[PDB]
Amino acid sequence: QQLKDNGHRALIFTQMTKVLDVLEQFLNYHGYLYMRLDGATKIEDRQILTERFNTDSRITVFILSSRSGGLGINLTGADTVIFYDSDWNPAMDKQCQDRCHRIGQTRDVHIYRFVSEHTIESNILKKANQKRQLDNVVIQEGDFTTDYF
Amino acid sequence: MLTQEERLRIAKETEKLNILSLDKFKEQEVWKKENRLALQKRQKQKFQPNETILQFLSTAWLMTPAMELEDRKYWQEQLNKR
Amino acid sequence: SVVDVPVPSLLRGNLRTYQKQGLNWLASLYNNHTNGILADEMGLGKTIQTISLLAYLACEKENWGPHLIVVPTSVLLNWEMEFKRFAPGFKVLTYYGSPQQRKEKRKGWNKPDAFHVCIVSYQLVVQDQHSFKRKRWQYMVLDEAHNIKNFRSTRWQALLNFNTQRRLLLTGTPLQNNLAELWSLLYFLMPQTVIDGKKVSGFADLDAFQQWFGRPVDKIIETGQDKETKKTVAKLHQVLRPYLLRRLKADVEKQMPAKYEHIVYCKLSKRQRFLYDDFMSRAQTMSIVNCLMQLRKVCNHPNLFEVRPILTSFVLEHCV
Amino acid sequence: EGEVTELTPEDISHVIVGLKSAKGTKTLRLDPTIYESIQREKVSIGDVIYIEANTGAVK
DNA sequence: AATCCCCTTGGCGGTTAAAACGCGG
DNA sequence: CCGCGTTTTAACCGCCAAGGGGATT
Ligand SMILES: Nc1ncnc2c1ncn2[C@@H]1O[C@H](COP(=O)(O)OP(=O)(O)OP(O)(O)=S)[C@@H](O)[C@H]1O
Ligand SMILES: [Mg+2]
């Protein structure tokens, strides 16, 4: 509701298709115009619907499957991404963000992650950002063709 | 073992053929995209074919005193014809 | 120790200055007669750097030998088209289609200079390795190195023993999960070599790498930021330096917009609480991982188990 | 339950309805009472219905 | 008598290789 | 009858996580 009031278009990233169905039912009750990308999408259909979402400005919410993001596609038209659930592999979330935050983007994006209090989701988030800390110690050290300072 | 000069000549021939293939691919891609757009437009134009249509229109109409005088003159002329 | 190499006369494009810097680095890597890992960020054009390296090798030296490109299928088609666009100077063979069409693409392939470079697929070569193994490869390039991030995976075993002069990996980030991926990539670049019947090792072993490096890194991740800790991370950085290559997106892409992260904690519902408690109680004593997946399903939505019923009247078979 | 893809009366006559879902499609033949229920629910092609076979209720 | 490779399993996403196939003639 | 050209899909591989075997010093 806040995102639609502010004029931002949201991207829902989930892990399993059943959550896609539940979310589709919910946003159909709330009347949001939307399109869904799933694993079973055909290659030409995948590209065509990606172009449709990029061009059409009337569909506020766009739903993806996080695992299918391994094959990246340009989705510069987004303005906010929502992570319904977290994954064990942080690089998958990194490329999911890349789908929305990449070269050519001119709108600042926001990251939303959904977790449940006093449950396992906190443990998944801990594992994810621990792996991200390891990634940081292996990446942040400068190795971009320079050693002087 | 073919020499590097003959290698470059064969590479130039490959470049020519590849340029031909590239322009062909570009034309094919443009054709595909335009056809998709045309199909969408045809879908949007779904209506009865070549049938007579009755239309009701209401719109705000701007008025000027000269136009009011012209309308009054037309009314007077119609009354005179009566 | 190197400088900007001349741009290839057969390269049809306008690379950026940093693209030229990467090309020079790869040229140094080949001239060092070694192999390396590309870890530059996405969108920078790792495909463009690879084709530029191929063009440099062809133009400066006589390095026009057969070259092998392995890509996922959709990205394979994209790679083939981009290869046509940037540097069409190589007669490129596209491995594609039904096995009969594969044999047709094979026919007469041994004739020299019939093809200059071949593009293949990961699972495709996993299935058809027996055909490819016969010929050595002048320069091998491995796009999307995250696909072979698993040492256990049959892909790594199939591609490990290939006979090639120099090899190159392409990945967005060499470490997605643990140090094991890092070792797998490194040792894929520098595996054991055999000369005169001897066993000569390029890098260490997986257990050796984890024993000599991972445990200090385990201590690093145990607590944030200790002179031993700094010494160990510096040693890891310095050993990884000669073979890695990565340019951050932030500095090179100065026009990128900002980004913010938000965390929201969502409380459970009555049905979710009951299902979670029941599954945890059942899992306390069966397998545990399936129970963890069921608990995650509880956390997602209760409808994943049972939907609320559509109440309707009971039907009698026949009236009195 | 599914999206209606056909509403063809057999001629008070049976109706032949085609229901499509995400996993498959199916074509059924419904009794005249169910046809009356569908008729009074203003169901057309593209509508999603819910027929309970035991009770003959259409929503 | 204390430790490694595979097990051990849901739901995911690729991704070729037959199934079953109008039609052209 | 036999492919031409075709679409669908079955079936298998990677996950990806925390223990848990049961073979080895
Ligand atoms: N010097 C250049 N001149 C023209 N176009 C360029 C240049 N460098 C890069 N590009 C474009 O940028 C893209 C580079 O190819 P990509 O495959 O998209 O890059 P990338 O490194 O593969 O990013 P990822 O990791 O695959 S998402 C292509 O669309 C090129 O047209
Ligand atoms: Mg890529």
mmCIF file of all heavy atoms in Angstrom, chain C residues 73-97:
data_model
loop_
_atom_site.group_PDB
_atom_site.id
_atom_site.type_symbol
_atom_site.label_atom_id
_atom_site.label_comp_id
_atom_site.label_asym_id
_atom_site.label_seq_id
_atom_site.Cartn_x
_atom_site.Cartn_y
_atom_site.Cartn_z
ATOM 1 N N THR C 73 22.747 -22.686 -22.492
ATOM 2 C CA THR C 73 22.206 -22.700 -23.851
ATOM 3 C C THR C 73 21.725 -21.323 -24.302
ATOM 4 O O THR C 73 22.081 -20.858 -25.391
ATOM 5 C CB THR C 73 21.067 -23.716 -23.944
ATOM 6 O OG1 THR C 73 21.495 -24.968 -23.392
ATOM 7 C CG2 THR C 73 20.657 -23.923 -25.395
ATOM 8 N N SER C 74 20.882 -20.670 -23.502
ATOM 9 C CA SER C 74 20.396 -19.350 -23.894
ATOM 10 C C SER C 74 21.549 -18.362 -23.976
ATOM 11 O O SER C 74 21.698 -17.623 -24.961
ATOM 12 C CB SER C 74 19.335 -18.866 -22.906
ATOM 13 O OG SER C 74 18.877 -17.569 -23.244
ATOM 14 N N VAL C 75 22.400 -18.360 -22.951
ATOM 15 C CA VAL C 75 23.594 -17.546 -23.002
ATOM 16 C C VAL C 75 24.530 -18.040 -24.094
ATOM 17 O O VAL C 75 25.333 -17.262 -24.602
ATOM 18 C CB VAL C 75 24.278 -17.524 -21.622
ATOM 19 C CG1 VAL C 75 25.321 -16.414 -21.553
ATOM 20 C CG2 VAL C 75 23.242 -17.367 -20.522
ATOM 21 N N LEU C 76 24.432 -19.312 -24.493
ATOM 22 C CA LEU C 76 25.225 -19.798 -25.621
ATOM 23 C C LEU C 76 24.814 -19.111 -26.916
ATOM 24 O O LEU C 76 25.663 -18.655 -27.692
ATOM 25 C CB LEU C 76 25.082 -21.317 -25.750
ATOM 26 C CG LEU C 76 25.765 -22.069 -26.897
ATOM 27 C CD1 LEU C 76 26.115 -23.468 -26.439
ATOM 28 C CD2 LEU C 76 24.884 -22.143 -28.140
ATOM 29 N N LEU C 77 23.508 -19.042 -27.174
ATOM 30 C CA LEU C 77 23.033 -18.336 -28.359
ATOM 31 C C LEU C 77 23.411 -16.862 -28.299
ATOM 32 O O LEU C 77 23.869 -16.283 -29.296
ATOM 33 C CB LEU C 77 21.520 -18.504 -28.489
ATOM 34 C CG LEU C 77 20.851 -17.979 -29.761
ATOM 35 C CD1 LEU C 77 19.829 -18.980 -30.271
ATOM 36 C CD2 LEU C 77 20.196 -16.630 -29.509
ATOM 37 N N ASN C 78 23.243 -16.243 -27.128
ATOM 38 C CA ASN C 78 23.625 -14.843 -26.979
ATOM 39 C C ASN C 78 25.117 -14.651 -27.237
ATOM 40 O O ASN C 78 25.521 -13.687 -27.896
ATOM 41 C CB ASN C 78 23.247 -14.342 -25.583
ATOM 42 C CG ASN C 78 21.766 -14.009 -25.459
ATOM 43 O OD1 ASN C 78 21.341 -12.895 -25.763
ATOM 44 N ND2 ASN C 78 20.978 -14.975 -25.001
ATOM 45 N N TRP C 79 25.947 -15.570 -26.738
ATOM 46 C CA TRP C 79 27.388 -15.488 -26.936
ATOM 47 C C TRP C 79 27.738 -15.610 -28.407
ATOM 48 O O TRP C 79 28.612 -14.900 -28.906
ATOM 49 C CB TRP C 79 28.094 -16.586 -26.134
ATOM 50 C CG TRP C 79 29.596 -16.517 -26.177
ATOM 51 C CD1 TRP C 79 30.392 -16.699 -27.270
ATOM 52 C CD2 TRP C 79 30.478 -16.299 -25.070
ATOM 53 N NE1 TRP C 79 31.712 -16.585 -26.918
ATOM 54 C CE2 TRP C 79 31.794 -16.341 -25.573
ATOM 55 C CE3 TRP C 79 30.286 -16.069 -23.704
ATOM 56 C CZ2 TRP C 79 32.912 -16.153 -24.762
ATOM 57 C CZ3 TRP C 79 31.399 -15.884 -22.899
ATOM 58 C CH2 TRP C 79 32.691 -15.923 -23.432
ATOM 59 N N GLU C 80 27.088 -16.536 -29.108
ATOM 60 C CA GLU C 80 27.366 -16.712 -30.526
ATOM 61 C C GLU C 80 27.028 -15.446 -31.300
ATOM 62 O O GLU C 80 27.820 -14.970 -32.123
ATOM 63 C CB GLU C 80 26.583 -17.910 -31.063
ATOM 64 C CG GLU C 80 26.963 -18.314 -32.471
ATOM 65 C CD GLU C 80 26.039 -17.718 -33.511
ATOM 66 O OE1 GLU C 80 24.915 -17.322 -33.143
ATOM 67 O OE2 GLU C 80 26.432 -17.658 -34.694
ATOM 68 N N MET C 81 25.864 -14.863 -31.023
ATOM 69 C CA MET C 81 25.487 -13.640 -31.724
ATOM 70 C C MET C 81 26.429 -12.486 -31.393
ATOM 71 O O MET C 81 26.820 -11.721 -32.286
ATOM 72 C CB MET C 81 24.041 -13.277 -31.400
ATOM 73 C CG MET C 81 23.053 -14.333 -31.865
ATOM 74 S SD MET C 81 23.147 -14.604 -33.647
ATOM 75 C CE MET C 81 21.819 -15.782 -33.897
ATOM 76 N N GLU C 82 26.816 -12.347 -30.121
ATOM 77 C CA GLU C 82 27.731 -11.274 -29.744
ATOM 78 C C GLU C 82 29.117 -11.485 -30.343
ATOM 79 O O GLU C 82 29.800 -10.513 -30.689
ATOM 80 C CB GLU C 82 27.813 -11.164 -28.224
ATOM 81 C CG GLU C 82 26.575 -10.559 -27.578
ATOM 82 C CD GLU C 82 26.143 -9.256 -28.229
ATOM 83 O OE1 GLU C 82 27.018 -8.429 -28.561
ATOM 84 O OE2 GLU C 82 24.923 -9.057 -28.406
ATOM 85 N N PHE C 83 29.542 -12.742 -30.476
ATOM 86 C CA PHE C 83 30.787 -13.054 -31.167
ATOM 87 C C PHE C 83 30.716 -12.619 -32.622
ATOM 88 O O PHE C 83 31.682 -12.071 -33.164
ATOM 89 C CB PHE C 83 31.059 -14.557 -31.066
ATOM 90 C CG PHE C 83 32.452 -14.967 -31.469
ATOM 91 C CD1 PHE C 83 33.355 -15.393 -30.515
ATOM 92 C CD2 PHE C 83 32.845 -14.969 -32.798
ATOM 93 C CE1 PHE C 83 34.629 -15.788 -30.868
ATOM 94 C CE2 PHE C 83 34.125 -15.359 -33.158
ATOM 95 C CZ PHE C 83 35.016 -15.768 -32.190
ATOM 96 N N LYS C 84 29.578 -12.869 -33.270
ATOM 97 C CA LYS C 84 29.390 -12.386 -34.633
ATOM 98 C C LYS C 84 29.467 -10.870 -34.690
ATOM 99 O O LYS C 84 30.062 -10.303 -35.613
ATOM 100 C CB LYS C 84 28.049 -12.864 -35.186
ATOM 101 C CG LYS C 84 27.945 -14.364 -35.346
ATOM 102 C CD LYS C 84 28.469 -14.792 -36.702
ATOM 103 C CE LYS C 84 28.439 -16.299 -36.848
ATOM 104 N NZ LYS C 84 28.639 -16.700 -38.263
ATOM 105 N N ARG C 85 28.869 -10.196 -33.710
ATOM 106 C CA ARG C 85 28.804 -8.739 -33.754
ATOM 107 C C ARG C 85 30.174 -8.104 -33.550
ATOM 108 O O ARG C 85 30.602 -7.267 -34.352
ATOM 109 C CB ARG C 85 27.809 -8.231 -32.716
ATOM 110 C CG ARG C 85 26.370 -8.496 -33.115
ATOM 111 C CD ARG C 85 25.426 -8.384 -31.935
ATOM 112 N NE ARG C 85 24.033 -8.550 -32.342
ATOM 113 C CZ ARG C 85 22.994 -8.504 -31.517
ATOM 114 N NH1 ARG C 85 23.152 -8.301 -30.218
ATOM 115 N NH2 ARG C 85 21.766 -8.668 -32.008
ATOM 116 N N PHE C 86 30.889 -8.499 -32.496
ATOM 117 C CA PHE C 86 32.127 -7.803 -32.156
ATOM 118 C C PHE C 86 33.266 -8.173 -33.100
ATOM 119 O O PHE C 86 33.812 -7.307 -33.793
ATOM 120 C CB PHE C 86 32.507 -8.088 -30.702
ATOM 121 C CG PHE C 86 31.819 -7.191 -29.713
ATOM 122 C CD1 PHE C 86 30.522 -7.445 -29.306
ATOM 123 C CD2 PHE C 86 32.473 -6.086 -29.195
ATOM 124 C CE1 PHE C 86 29.888 -6.615 -28.398
ATOM 125 C CE2 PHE C 86 31.845 -5.253 -28.285
ATOM 126 C CZ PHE C 86 30.552 -5.517 -27.887
ATOM 127 N N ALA C 87 33.641 -9.450 -33.143
ATOM 128 C CA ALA C 87 34.798 -9.897 -33.917
ATOM 129 C C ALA C 87 34.394 -11.072 -34.791
ATOM 130 O O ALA C 87 34.513 -12.238 -34.391
ATOM 131 C CB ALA C 87 35.970 -10.274 -33.012
ATOM 132 N N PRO C 88 33.900 -10.802 -35.992
ATOM 133 C CA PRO C 88 33.491 -11.888 -36.889
ATOM 134 C C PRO C 88 34.652 -12.482 -37.669
ATOM 135 O O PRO C 88 34.443 -13.173 -38.670
ATOM 136 C CB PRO C 88 32.485 -11.202 -37.818
ATOM 137 C CG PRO C 88 32.929 -9.785 -37.860
ATOM 138 C CD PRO C 88 33.548 -9.474 -36.524
ATOM 139 N N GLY C 89 35.880 -12.220 -37.224
ATOM 140 C CA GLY C 89 37.046 -12.686 -37.950
ATOM 141 C C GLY C 89 37.333 -14.167 -37.841
ATOM 142 O O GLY C 89 38.173 -14.674 -38.590
ATOM 143 N N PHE C 90 36.663 -14.872 -36.936
ATOM 144 C CA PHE C 90 36.885 -16.296 -36.723
ATOM 145 C C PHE C 90 35.701 -17.082 -37.265
ATOM 146 O O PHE C 90 34.550 -16.785 -36.927
ATOM 147 C CB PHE C 90 37.068 -16.608 -35.235
ATOM 148 C CG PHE C 90 38.158 -15.822 -34.576
ATOM 149 C CD1 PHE C 90 37.887 -14.596 -33.995
ATOM 150 C CD2 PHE C 90 39.453 -16.305 -34.534
ATOM 151 C CE1 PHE C 90 38.886 -13.867 -33.382
ATOM 152 C CE2 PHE C 90 40.458 -15.577 -33.923
ATOM 153 C CZ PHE C 90 40.172 -14.357 -33.346
ATOM 154 N N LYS C 91 35.980 -18.095 -38.081
ATOM 155 C CA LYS C 91 34.916 -18.986 -38.537
ATOM 156 C C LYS C 91 34.473 -19.825 -37.349
ATOM 157 O O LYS C 91 35.132 -20.792 -36.964
ATOM 158 C CB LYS C 91 35.378 -19.849 -39.706
ATOM 159 C CG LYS C 91 36.753 -20.468 -39.575
ATOM 160 C CD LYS C 91 36.999 -21.422 -40.728
ATOM 161 C CE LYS C 91 37.452 -20.670 -41.972
ATOM 162 N NZ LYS C 91 37.759 -21.580 -43.111
ATOM 163 N N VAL C 92 33.343 -19.449 -36.764
ATOM 164 C CA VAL C 92 32.881 -20.013 -35.504
ATOM 165 C C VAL C 92 31.918 -21.154 -35.795
ATOM 166 O O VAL C 92 31.046 -21.045 -36.665
ATOM 167 C CB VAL C 92 32.232 -18.936 -34.615
ATOM 168 C CG1 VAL C 92 30.987 -18.352 -35.270
ATOM 169 C CG2 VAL C 92 31.892 -19.506 -33.236
ATOM 170 N N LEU C 93 32.099 -22.259 -35.087
ATOM 171 C CA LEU C 93 31.226 -23.417 -35.189
ATOM 172 C C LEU C 93 30.287 -23.422 -33.991
ATOM 173 O O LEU C 93 30.739 -23.353 -32.843
ATOM 174 C CB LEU C 93 32.045 -24.704 -35.243
ATOM 175 C CG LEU C 93 31.261 -26.014 -35.243
ATOM 176 C CD1 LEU C 93 30.357 -26.109 -36.470
ATOM 177 C CD2 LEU C 93 32.224 -27.193 -35.176
ATOM 178 N N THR C 94 28.987 -23.502 -34.258
ATOM 179 C CA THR C 94 27.970 -23.513 -33.212
ATOM 180 C C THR C 94 27.458 -24.939 -33.021
ATOM 181 O O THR C 94 26.848 -25.525 -33.923
ATOM 182 C CB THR C 94 26.843 -22.523 -33.531
ATOM 183 O OG1 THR C 94 25.873 -22.529 -32.475
ATOM 184 C CG2 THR C 94 26.170 -22.810 -34.872
ATOM 185 N N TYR C 95 27.733 -25.505 -31.850
ATOM 186 C CA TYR C 95 27.245 -26.835 -31.526
ATOM 187 C C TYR C 95 25.802 -26.735 -31.058
ATOM 188 O O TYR C 95 25.496 -26.000 -30.115
ATOM 189 C CB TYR C 95 28.119 -27.478 -30.455
ATOM 190 C CG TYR C 95 28.178 -28.980 -30.556
ATOM 191 C CD1 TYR C 95 29.270 -29.613 -31.131
ATOM 192 C CD2 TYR C 95 27.141 -29.767 -30.079
ATOM 193 C CE1 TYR C 95 29.329 -30.989 -31.225
ATOM 194 C CE2 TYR C 95 27.190 -31.144 -30.165
ATOM 195 C CZ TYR C 95 28.285 -31.751 -30.741
ATOM 196 O OH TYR C 95 28.338 -33.123 -30.831
ATOM 197 N N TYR C 96 24.915 -27.476 -31.715
ATOM 198 C CA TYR C 96 23.494 -27.187 -31.608
ATOM 199 C C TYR C 96 22.686 -28.388 -32.074
ATOM 200 O O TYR C 96 23.162 -29.216 -32.854
ATOM 201 C CB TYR C 96 23.145 -25.946 -32.439
ATOM 202 C CG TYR C 96 21.710 -25.497 -32.359
ATOM 203 C CD1 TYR C 96 21.250 -24.764 -31.275
ATOM 204 C CD2 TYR C 96 20.814 -25.798 -33.375
ATOM 205 C CE1 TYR C 96 19.937 -24.346 -31.202
ATOM 206 C CE2 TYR C 96 19.498 -25.387 -33.312
ATOM 207 C CZ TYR C 96 19.064 -24.661 -32.223
ATOM 208 O OH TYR C 96 17.753 -24.249 -32.156
ATOM 209 N N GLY C 97 21.457 -28.471 -31.575
ATOM 210 C CA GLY C 97 20.440 -29.302 -32.190
ATOM 211 C C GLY C 97 20.533 -30.790 -31.897
ATOM 212 O O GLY C 97 21.247 -31.261 -31.005
#
